[PDB]
Amino acid sequence: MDKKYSIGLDIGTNSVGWAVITDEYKVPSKKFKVLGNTDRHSIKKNLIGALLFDSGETAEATRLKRTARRRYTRRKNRICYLQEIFSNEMAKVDDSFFHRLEESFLVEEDKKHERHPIFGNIVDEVAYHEKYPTIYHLRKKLVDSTDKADLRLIYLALAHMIKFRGHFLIEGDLNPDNSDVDKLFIQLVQTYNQLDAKAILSARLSKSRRLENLIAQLPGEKKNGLFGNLIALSLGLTPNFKSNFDLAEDAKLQLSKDTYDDDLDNLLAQIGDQYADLFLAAKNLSDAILLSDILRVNTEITKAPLSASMIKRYDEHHQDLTLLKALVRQQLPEKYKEIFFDQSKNGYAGYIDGGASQEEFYKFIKPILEKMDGTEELLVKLNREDLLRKQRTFDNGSIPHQIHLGELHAILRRQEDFYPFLKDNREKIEKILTFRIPYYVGPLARGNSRFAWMTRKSEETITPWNFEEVVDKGASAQSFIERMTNFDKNLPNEKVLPKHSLLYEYFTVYNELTKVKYVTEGMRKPAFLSGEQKKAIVDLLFKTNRKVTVKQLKEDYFKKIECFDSVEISGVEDRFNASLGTYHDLLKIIKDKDFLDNEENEDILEDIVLTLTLFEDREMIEERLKTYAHLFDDKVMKQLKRRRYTGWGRLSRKLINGIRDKQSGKTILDFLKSDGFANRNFMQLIHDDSLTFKEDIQKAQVSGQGDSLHEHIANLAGSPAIKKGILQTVKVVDELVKVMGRHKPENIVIEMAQITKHVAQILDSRMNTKYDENDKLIREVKVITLKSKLVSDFRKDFQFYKVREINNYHHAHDAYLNAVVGTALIKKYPNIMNFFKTEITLANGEIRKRPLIETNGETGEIVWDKGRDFATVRKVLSMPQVNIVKKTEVQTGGFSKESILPKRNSDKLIARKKDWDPKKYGGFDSPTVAYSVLVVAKVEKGKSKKLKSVKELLGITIMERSSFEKNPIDFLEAKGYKEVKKDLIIKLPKYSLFELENGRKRMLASAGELQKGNELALPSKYVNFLYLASHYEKLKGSPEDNEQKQLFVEQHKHYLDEIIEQISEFSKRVILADANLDKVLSAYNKHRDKPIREQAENIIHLFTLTNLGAPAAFKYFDTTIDRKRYTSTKEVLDATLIHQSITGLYETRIDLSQLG
RNA sequence: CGAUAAAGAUGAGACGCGUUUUAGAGCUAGAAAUAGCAAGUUAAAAUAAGGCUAGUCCGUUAUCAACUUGAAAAAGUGGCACCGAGUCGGUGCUU
DNA sequence: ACGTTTGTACTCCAGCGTCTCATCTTTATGCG
DNA sequence: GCTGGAGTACAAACGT
């Protein structure tokens, strides 16, 4: 039979609601066959339901932890590099110093050499920690020593600098001597003249505000160049020097960039060295502004100013510490034990030994400082956030690597005379500090990664010193862009040409001009310009004028070439749109119309623009054009190198001039140039009986021939969770087609709360798959897209109200009403929703009458009867059995919580490495269970060695999962299970459904906790009343309708008692939370004499006691009911396990009572 | 109709902090128990266990009823009406 | 008839800030 | 924040 039906969907980020209706808008009911060892053999089910699943996560967290893993690996490799550089000498001075460093984490019994990590004795360790209290004291000492020092001290200082090196944001060497901001500004004005500045520059005001403030209070007269260089200093960026200093072109000589030197040279040619002193002062002032807050110390007594500043911070911590100690011992003696001994408060002891930040300690110690006297400067430092500070602090992220490199340079230039190996390896260690893999090279994989693009020039290990001789950086950055840009849509095998290609612009000119038509003198035939005439017009106007030519210019060229027949032109605009811009720039730079005109040099120019579009670091551009420097002078070689092109086109070169029909041999560009008086455009050759259009379809089919369902949802443009929803929606559609005897649905209706267009296309592609004799796709299944507004409109107009707090039936009810509205309006119209209200209002206040049976105007149709349609959809909405399935999913993600908890005697701690005993070291805690397994075996119970046979539910950790799947039997025997039964092991993922007495259901949250599994089928009257009462002040309708709703909600005030009675009955049947229910009834009893709106707004809040899923806390009326957790899955082992299909219609029920 | 801007997705390269264990000798009184006093700012190592394909890679995204085949991918498996409704029941027909 | 284990109820806890660069869609806004 | 793990105190129920 035909068995006509339709399928409705509601795709969500967290759920997929589905419904099947017939031609009479009825849900069909069908009896299904179940499997398993249970006694039930057939179950009657209704063809409406929803599928719930966890939200799809983005890849960002995985990306960040992957990047962190790479960073830790690289830092460990730097430590190994420096431990191979110092290796031979360190074997002589103190062998196993590196080994004492590596075993520092272990407890003293687990150590192999000595507990003291540096010198191996107690006296020298104490002397080191007293002579150099922090690492910065040793850093300052080794920077300024002039004496020989122990090699361990040099290693510790330089290793601390390499391990914590700083940011690479400031490009260019930063001299630490420039520190006076006021002198920098006055020197800028003075050098300009020859050719509170400190407070204003170092103020925390914005760079825009800072420049504006200095410009407002500007003593310099006729000194706009001083103001521009001041912008280039404080802001770090000058404006266009064509107006700032009368340069030839717009020159933005912004500092802190590698292009600063090249733009400065361009300005020196463009201005004529009339701003060099300004640029020089700007650089000095930019430095002194940048290092101002970083190095808050005078810079005339040391070469390591960061060490001096941190020593000053340590010293002020000590001074204000002893003074605060004295003042609390002298004025508030009842608080010294709390501030300086208690590690649980936010005092000093919590700030150092506990877990208090600087903010928390400041907030705690401020009121103590206020009430006591003598605390003036301590308070002043606290507002300046400079009281009792530490060196390793949150604000150390602004220290540039130039400072650490300067200190490291100072030790390798102060200790190189005594230790000779430092002198030849100085640049090696400096490279180890400063080497940073570029963003266009990526992971240095040998081919064993799915994220790598790097190409190797050699086959050797990539050390930080052979990176430029082993990694082909050109091909690396080429592959970096070439994996990211999309392939050709027509030919999905090969890549895509740059947007600024000469071939593409020539194609656009010739395609527009081929679409353009001329007009003859007598016949006035459109046709087109001839191919020779086309090239002549291009060279006359489009190759002459950089901007597009006007129709007047085209007419002037037509009359200029030969005597015009008629300058009128058909199929053309007032001005053209295609421009020969890149050829014009090459004619303005290369300045010869020979290489840019000869077709033998076309591939050269295409590679030129490939380089300009591809690379943006300008050294890469430098080398790739240096390959081609033999055909041009050096000046244009360093001028065109500074040209950057942005953008990628949507067409490829094989589509444009690579595909040629075997009958003709002409390219698509050649066909556009000369079509034999046919004037066919690109879309003409792409959609005709020519051989070009056939090969495109054959390649679009042959290549990407798989194009799997998960692939095509995966390669879309949207959030991952909505892609999960779309994929589950498609699977639901397939199974719903299967359920009805594999007959196709007549319509499919879609609603999501461009991606809608795409999911419509997927469903249309899978359902509509039949072509006629003339190869025309017959639309057997009309996939319909619907906005969400219409559904809510009817929901409110026909009072088909939803409270989402009752149950998850509202999802499938949205799906059913979706497939009611959509297929009604596809019939009534083949206000638009005014065909619905029978008493439709008018501008005169008249309730214009409507027919009971609505119909289409043009032809007779049963679109909507205002009787027996209410009854059907009311029945389906009040229908108690609708199939909600929570998607059983194996958990993936982190093994446990990321917090490293301290040591305990508990066994729940997890070994953070292989041999780290957690009772000594501590470690991770609370692991994540991948899935639970039901194991029937016998355990060792009792002191008398008794094998008590037991059935238990054991949770498998994500970490344990691979070891369990390698050998389940051996894993169980290692766990403590003797003589297990291999064939009764059942894999139970999260949200596995179990059925118990009185229809009670529980979902498996884990091996030791369950979730509520039942749904309260509260009738339509109660949910309609609850929406009317809670939206009492937000009715948003006509005043008569609002008054009628108010009268209706006042007349049924007794419905609250019926609602709470339904809640109590359903909670007593399946929820089984006696104390929570008693507190609920006490709270409802206490709060009866309150208005109905608030009462129903909190009866809505009540319904999360009975909601599907995890137990949750809630508040009714100023009282919080804490969650009743089911923390024992012992009842589940005697229950009935239900396996369900994605729709849930097809079931497999296992009686676990019979297993064992 | 080019063009700009915002948001989102994906990928790469870098810092700063935090946590853990250990190292920085606590002293004095007291038989001890516990007090009085001193002091504190730093470093090493690890930062998903680990894996083989041994890379200055990979390891937390996406995918996932049961059943029968398939290496996997993937394919295959469950009769239809009608009257009723508290998580679906009943009746008839036919396999 | 002690003893040990499983059921309850209750409380607490959960890795986080920044910067540079690149490539795609998808919305949006004034032009006119 | 969610919601699952874990610790703690206290008693009921099952083992021997």
Short mmCIF file of C-alpha atoms in Angstrom, two decimals, chain A residues 808-1143:
data_model
loop_
_atom_site.label_atom_id
_atom_site.label_comp_id
_atom_site.label_asym_id
_atom_site.label_seq_id
_atom_site.Cartn_x
_atom_site.Cartn_y
_atom_site.Cartn_z
CA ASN A 808 10.46 16.24 28.63
CA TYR A 809 7.20 15.50 26.76
CA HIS A 810 7.22 19.13 25.59
CA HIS A 811 10.00 18.36 23.06
CA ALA A 812 8.01 15.74 21.14
CA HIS A 813 4.90 17.87 21.57
CA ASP A 814 6.79 20.71 19.85
CA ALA A 815 7.67 18.23 17.09
CA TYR A 816 4.02 17.17 16.69
CA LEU A 817 2.73 20.75 16.66
CA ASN A 818 5.53 21.60 14.18
CA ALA A 819 4.16 18.90 11.87
CA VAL A 820 0.67 20.27 12.47
CA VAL A 821 1.27 23.98 11.66
CA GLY A 822 3.56 23.33 8.70
CA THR A 823 1.32 20.87 6.91
CA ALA A 824 -1.77 23.00 7.62
CA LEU A 825 -0.26 26.11 6.06
CA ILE A 826 1.13 24.16 3.07
CA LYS A 827 -2.56 23.44 2.33
CA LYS A 828 -4.34 26.71 3.21
CA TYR A 829 -1.86 29.06 1.41
CA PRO A 830 -0.06 27.01 -1.24
CA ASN A 831 -1.77 38.50 9.31
CA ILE A 832 -1.06 35.11 7.73
CA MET A 833 -2.10 33.39 10.98
CA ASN A 834 -5.51 35.12 10.98
CA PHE A 835 -7.07 32.18 9.11
CA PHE A 836 -6.94 30.46 12.53
CA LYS A 837 -9.08 32.63 14.84
CA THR A 838 -12.78 32.15 14.12
CA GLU A 839 -13.68 35.46 15.81
CA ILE A 840 -10.99 37.33 13.86
CA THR A 841 -10.79 40.96 14.95
CA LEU A 842 -11.11 43.91 12.57
CA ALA A 843 -10.18 47.59 12.58
CA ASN A 844 -13.77 48.49 13.56
CA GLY A 845 -13.65 46.10 16.53
CA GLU A 846 -15.89 43.66 14.65
CA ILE A 847 -15.28 39.95 15.20
CA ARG A 848 -15.41 38.96 11.54
CA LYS A 849 -16.84 35.47 11.32
CA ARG A 850 -14.94 32.59 9.78
CA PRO A 851 -16.16 29.26 8.39
CA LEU A 852 -15.92 26.29 10.74
CA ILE A 853 -14.21 24.28 7.99
CA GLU A 854 -11.54 26.49 6.43
CA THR A 855 -10.56 25.94 2.82
CA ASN A 856 -8.16 27.17 0.17
CA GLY A 857 -9.49 29.97 -2.02
CA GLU A 858 -8.37 28.71 -5.43
CA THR A 859 -9.38 25.05 -5.04
CA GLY A 860 -11.37 22.98 -2.58
CA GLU A 861 -9.26 21.63 0.27
CA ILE A 862 -9.79 20.42 3.84
CA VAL A 863 -7.14 22.63 5.42
CA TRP A 864 -8.55 23.21 8.94
CA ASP A 865 -11.83 22.26 10.63
CA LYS A 866 -12.46 24.24 13.85
CA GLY A 867 -14.07 21.04 15.17
CA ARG A 868 -12.45 17.56 15.61
CA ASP A 869 -8.95 19.04 15.17
CA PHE A 870 -8.89 20.49 18.67
CA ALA A 871 -9.97 17.06 19.89
CA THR A 872 -7.21 15.16 18.05
CA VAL A 873 -4.32 17.47 18.94
CA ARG A 874 -5.66 17.81 22.52
CA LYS A 875 -5.70 14.02 22.76
CA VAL A 876 -2.15 13.72 21.42
CA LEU A 877 -0.90 16.45 23.76
CA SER A 878 -2.64 14.83 26.75
CA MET A 879 -1.39 11.41 25.61
CA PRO A 880 0.54 9.76 28.48
CA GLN A 881 2.96 7.49 26.56
CA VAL A 882 5.55 9.27 24.39
CA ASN A 883 9.01 7.80 23.85
CA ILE A 884 11.79 9.87 25.43
CA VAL A 885 15.19 8.17 25.22
CA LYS A 886 18.33 9.50 26.89
CA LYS A 887 21.25 8.66 24.60
CA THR A 888 23.48 6.04 26.23
CA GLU A 889 26.99 7.40 25.76
CA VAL A 890 30.41 6.15 26.81
CA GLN A 891 32.08 8.99 28.68
CA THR A 892 35.18 10.64 27.21
CA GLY A 893 37.40 13.42 28.48
CA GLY A 894 39.62 13.92 31.49
CA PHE A 895 40.65 10.94 33.58
CA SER A 896 39.80 12.75 36.83
CA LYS A 897 39.74 16.18 38.44
CA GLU A 898 42.79 18.28 37.58
CA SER A 899 43.49 19.36 41.17
CA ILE A 900 46.56 17.69 42.69
CA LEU A 901 45.34 17.02 46.23
CA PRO A 902 47.84 16.60 49.10
CA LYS A 903 48.84 13.28 50.60
CA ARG A 904 46.29 11.10 52.40
CA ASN A 905 46.17 7.59 53.82
CA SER A 906 43.09 7.02 51.61
CA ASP A 907 43.31 4.60 48.68
CA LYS A 908 41.10 6.81 46.47
CA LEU A 909 44.17 8.85 45.47
CA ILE A 910 45.61 8.04 42.04
CA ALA A 911 49.31 7.66 41.29
CA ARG A 912 50.30 10.71 39.26
CA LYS A 913 53.21 8.74 37.76
CA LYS A 914 54.02 5.03 37.56
CA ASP A 915 56.12 4.68 40.73
CA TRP A 916 54.73 7.58 42.81
CA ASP A 917 53.00 6.07 45.85
CA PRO A 918 50.09 8.45 46.64
CA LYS A 919 50.45 7.93 50.41
CA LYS A 920 53.79 9.77 50.15
CA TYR A 921 53.07 12.19 47.31
CA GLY A 922 49.33 12.66 46.89
CA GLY A 923 47.82 13.15 43.47
CA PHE A 924 44.58 13.03 41.53
CA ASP A 925 41.21 12.11 43.01
CA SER A 926 37.60 11.38 41.91
CA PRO A 927 38.13 9.65 38.54
CA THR A 928 35.62 9.66 35.69
CA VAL A 929 33.97 6.31 34.95
CA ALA A 930 33.86 5.52 31.23
CA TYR A 931 31.20 2.82 31.65
CA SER A 932 30.06 0.25 34.19
CA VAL A 933 30.26 -3.52 33.78
CA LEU A 934 28.02 -6.04 35.54
CA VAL A 935 30.26 -8.85 36.80
CA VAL A 936 29.05 -12.18 38.22
CA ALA A 937 31.84 -13.89 40.17
CA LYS A 938 32.94 -14.99 43.65
CA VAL A 939 34.97 -12.82 46.02
CA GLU A 940 37.20 -13.47 49.01
CA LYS A 941 34.87 -12.58 51.89
CA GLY A 942 35.35 -13.25 55.59
CA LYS A 943 38.44 -14.13 57.60
CA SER A 944 37.65 -17.85 57.17
CA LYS A 945 38.50 -17.63 53.41
CA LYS A 946 34.95 -18.03 52.11
CA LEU A 947 34.12 -17.68 48.40
CA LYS A 948 30.79 -15.88 48.63
CA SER A 949 29.32 -15.66 45.14
CA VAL A 950 28.28 -12.09 44.41
CA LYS A 951 26.82 -9.92 41.65
CA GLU A 952 28.26 -6.37 41.63
CA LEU A 953 28.47 -3.36 39.28
CA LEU A 954 32.07 -2.24 38.72
CA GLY A 955 32.89 1.10 37.11
CA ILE A 956 35.62 1.25 34.48
CA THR A 957 37.71 4.42 34.50
CA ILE A 958 38.60 6.10 31.20
CA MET A 959 42.23 5.47 32.20
CA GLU A 960 41.35 1.84 32.99
CA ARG A 961 39.33 1.41 29.78
CA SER A 962 42.08 0.31 27.38
CA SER A 963 43.56 -2.10 29.93
CA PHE A 964 40.11 -3.56 30.58
CA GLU A 965 39.38 -3.94 26.86
CA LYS A 966 42.74 -5.64 26.27
CA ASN A 967 41.90 -8.44 28.73
CA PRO A 968 38.68 -8.17 30.79
CA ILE A 969 39.29 -11.45 32.64
CA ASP A 970 42.80 -10.55 33.81
CA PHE A 971 41.64 -7.04 34.75
CA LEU A 972 38.89 -8.52 36.92
CA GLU A 973 41.27 -11.02 38.54
CA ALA A 974 43.68 -8.19 39.34
CA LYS A 975 40.75 -6.22 40.81
CA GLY A 976 39.93 -9.05 43.24
CA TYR A 977 37.49 -11.15 41.25
CA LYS A 978 38.03 -14.91 41.26
CA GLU A 979 36.55 -17.25 38.63
CA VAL A 980 34.53 -14.69 36.69
CA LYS A 981 31.90 -15.59 34.11
CA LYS A 982 33.07 -14.18 30.78
CA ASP A 983 29.78 -14.28 28.88
CA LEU A 984 27.65 -12.50 31.52
CA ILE A 985 29.75 -9.32 31.45
CA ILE A 986 27.41 -6.55 30.29
CA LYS A 987 28.75 -3.15 29.25
CA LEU A 988 26.55 -0.43 30.73
CA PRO A 989 27.32 3.14 29.60
CA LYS A 990 25.99 6.27 31.26
CA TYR A 991 22.18 6.73 31.26
CA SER A 992 21.61 2.98 30.91
CA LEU A 993 17.92 2.39 31.62
CA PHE A 994 16.61 -0.05 34.23
CA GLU A 995 12.98 -0.90 35.03
CA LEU A 996 11.78 -1.65 38.56
CA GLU A 997 8.58 -2.20 40.56
CA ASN A 998 5.48 -0.06 39.86
CA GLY A 999 7.05 1.12 36.60
CA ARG A 1000 9.86 2.90 38.48
CA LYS A 1001 12.87 3.59 36.23
CA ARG A 1002 16.45 4.63 36.98
CA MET A 1003 19.24 5.68 34.63
CA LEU A 1004 22.83 4.72 35.42
CA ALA A 1005 24.75 7.90 36.21
CA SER A 1006 27.75 5.79 37.29
CA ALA A 1007 28.51 2.51 39.04
CA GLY A 1008 27.57 4.02 42.40
CA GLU A 1009 24.86 6.57 41.60
CA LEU A 1010 21.57 6.56 39.69
CA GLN A 1011 19.28 9.16 38.13
CA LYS A 1012 15.52 9.60 38.03
CA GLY A 1013 14.11 7.80 35.00
CA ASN A 1014 10.38 8.52 35.01
CA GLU A 1015 8.17 11.31 33.63
CA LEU A 1016 5.10 12.86 35.26
CA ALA A 1017 2.24 12.81 32.72
CA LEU A 1018 0.47 15.88 34.07
CA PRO A 1019 -2.71 16.54 32.03
CA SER A 1020 -3.26 19.47 29.69
CA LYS A 1021 -5.52 21.39 32.10
CA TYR A 1022 -2.81 21.79 34.75
CA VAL A 1023 -0.03 22.91 32.39
CA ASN A 1024 -2.41 25.33 30.63
CA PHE A 1025 -3.45 26.76 34.00
CA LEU A 1026 0.19 26.97 35.13
CA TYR A 1027 1.20 28.97 32.05
CA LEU A 1028 -1.81 31.28 32.49
CA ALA A 1029 -1.07 31.94 36.17
CA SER A 1030 2.70 32.44 35.87
CA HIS A 1031 2.34 34.79 32.87
CA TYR A 1032 -0.42 36.75 34.62
CA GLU A 1033 1.45 40.07 34.35
CA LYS A 1034 2.88 39.16 30.91
CA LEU A 1035 -0.23 38.05 29.01
CA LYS A 1036 0.68 40.22 25.96
CA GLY A 1037 -2.69 40.24 24.25
CA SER A 1038 -5.99 42.04 23.84
CA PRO A 1039 -7.51 43.55 27.01
CA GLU A 1040 -10.65 41.43 26.60
CA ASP A 1041 -8.54 38.27 26.25
CA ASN A 1042 -6.44 39.31 29.26
CA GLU A 1043 -9.59 39.89 31.33
CA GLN A 1044 -10.97 36.50 30.25
CA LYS A 1045 -7.68 34.83 31.20
CA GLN A 1046 -7.74 36.60 34.58
CA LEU A 1047 -11.30 35.39 35.19
CA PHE A 1048 -10.33 31.84 34.17
CA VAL A 1049 -7.28 31.81 36.44
CA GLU A 1050 -9.34 33.20 39.34
CA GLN A 1051 -12.11 30.62 38.82
CA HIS A 1052 -9.76 27.62 39.04
CA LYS A 1053 -7.73 28.50 42.15
CA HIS A 1054 -8.39 24.96 43.43
CA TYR A 1055 -6.17 23.53 40.66
CA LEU A 1056 -3.05 24.13 42.80
CA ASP A 1057 -4.15 21.46 45.29
CA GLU A 1058 -4.73 19.01 42.44
CA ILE A 1059 -1.28 19.83 41.01
CA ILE A 1060 0.49 19.23 44.32
CA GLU A 1061 -1.57 16.04 44.78
CA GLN A 1062 -0.33 14.81 41.39
CA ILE A 1063 3.23 15.75 42.39
CA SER A 1064 2.87 13.89 45.69
CA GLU A 1065 1.45 10.75 44.06
CA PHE A 1066 4.13 10.62 41.35
CA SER A 1067 6.88 11.28 43.91
CA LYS A 1068 5.56 8.53 46.19
CA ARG A 1069 5.43 6.09 43.29
CA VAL A 1070 8.80 6.53 41.57
CA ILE A 1071 10.87 9.37 43.13
CA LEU A 1072 10.94 7.96 46.71
CA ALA A 1073 12.22 11.11 48.44
CA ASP A 1074 10.21 11.17 51.67
CA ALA A 1075 11.99 13.99 53.52
CA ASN A 1076 12.07 16.26 50.47
CA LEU A 1077 8.38 15.59 49.78
CA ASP A 1078 7.47 16.31 53.42
CA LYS A 1079 9.40 19.59 53.32
CA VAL A 1080 7.62 20.38 50.04
CA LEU A 1081 4.16 19.86 51.53
CA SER A 1082 5.13 21.85 54.64
CA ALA A 1083 6.34 24.73 52.45
CA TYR A 1084 3.14 24.62 50.38
CA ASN A 1085 1.03 24.52 53.56
CA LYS A 1086 2.87 27.52 55.01
CA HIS A 1087 2.46 29.63 51.86
CA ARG A 1088 -1.21 29.14 50.91
CA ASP A 1089 -2.38 32.70 51.63
CA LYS A 1090 -0.36 34.27 48.78
CA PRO A 1091 -1.39 35.53 45.32
CA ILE A 1092 -1.86 32.91 42.62
CA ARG A 1093 0.83 34.28 40.27
CA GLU A 1094 3.76 33.80 42.69
CA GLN A 1095 2.28 30.53 43.95
CA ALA A 1096 2.19 29.04 40.45
CA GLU A 1097 5.59 30.54 39.57
CA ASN A 1098 7.03 28.50 42.44
CA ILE A 1099 4.88 25.41 41.80
CA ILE A 1100 6.71 25.55 38.46
CA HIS A 1101 9.96 25.58 40.47
CA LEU A 1102 8.67 22.55 42.40
CA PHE A 1103 8.73 20.27 39.35
CA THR A 1104 12.50 19.65 39.31
CA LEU A 1105 11.94 17.20 42.17
CA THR A 1106 10.20 14.96 39.62
CA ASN A 1107 12.21 15.90 36.51
CA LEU A 1108 14.06 13.33 34.42
CA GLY A 1109 17.79 13.11 35.04
CA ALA A 1110 20.09 13.97 37.93
CA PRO A 1111 18.60 15.04 41.28
CA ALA A 1112 18.85 18.79 41.84
CA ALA A 1113 18.19 21.27 44.62
CA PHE A 1114 15.47 23.90 44.37
CA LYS A 1115 13.83 26.75 46.27
CA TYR A 1116 10.05 27.11 46.62
CA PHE A 1117 9.34 30.05 48.98
CA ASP A 1118 12.54 31.26 50.71
CA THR A 1119 13.25 27.60 51.65
CA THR A 1120 15.79 25.44 49.82
CA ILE A 1121 15.16 21.71 49.39
CA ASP A 1122 18.46 19.89 48.95
CA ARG A 1123 18.71 17.02 46.49
CA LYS A 1124 17.89 13.39 47.32
CA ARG A 1125 20.71 11.45 45.66
CA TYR A 1126 20.40 7.73 44.91
CA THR A 1127 23.98 6.78 45.82
CA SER A 1128 23.56 2.98 45.74
CA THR A 1129 23.02 0.91 42.58
CA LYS A 1130 22.17 -2.29 44.46
CA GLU A 1131 18.50 -2.30 43.44
CA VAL A 1132 19.45 -2.05 39.74
CA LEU A 1133 21.16 -5.48 39.75
CA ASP A 1134 17.79 -7.22 40.29
CA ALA A 1135 15.94 -4.96 37.83
CA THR A 1136 15.11 -5.21 34.11
CA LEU A 1137 17.71 -3.70 31.78
CA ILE A 1138 16.15 -2.00 28.74
CA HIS A 1139 18.07 -1.58 25.50
CA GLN A 1140 16.44 0.94 23.19
CA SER A 1141 16.84 2.05 19.60
CA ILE A 1142 17.42 5.73 18.86
CA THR A 1143 13.66 6.23 18.50
#
